Design a protein around this ligand. Sequence first.
Ligand code: HEM
Length: 112
Amino acid sequence: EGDAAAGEKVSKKCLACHTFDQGGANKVGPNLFGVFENTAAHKDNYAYSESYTEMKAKGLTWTEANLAAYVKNPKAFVLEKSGDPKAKSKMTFKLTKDDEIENVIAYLKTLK
Ligand code: HEM
């Protein structure tokens, strides 16, 4: 689902905190090239909130459906999927429009 060309547009909403290119810098949040189908806490050089390390132990991978639920409300996400009530997220920013989420995901799928 999802037009990865409208997705690239929406993605401009993430660029204050993230980069997209291969080898890219960790600005505020980790670079997101390669994120699709990859583990939670997927970048080794970024210091993630403990809650992402605990999704990653569980074997959570960034599927279409877990990116969908995440980018709707990261903080509810990380509580939910970690099982740790004291779960923190530094993200905070959410997408609320369904078309947007679907399109953004379709454009994450083209970055490896
Ligand atoms: C639609 C726009 C964005 C998308 C697609 C995006 C996607 C994601 C993804 C998939 C992760 C987790 C990667 C991992 O588990 O390895 C993440 C982490 C994070 N994002 Fe974003 N994000 C977006 C916008 C933002 C913006 C606007 C901010 C800052 C205001 C930001 C800050 C962060 C931070 C700080 C983390 C790490 C969280 C922590 O360890 O607590 N993100 N992002």
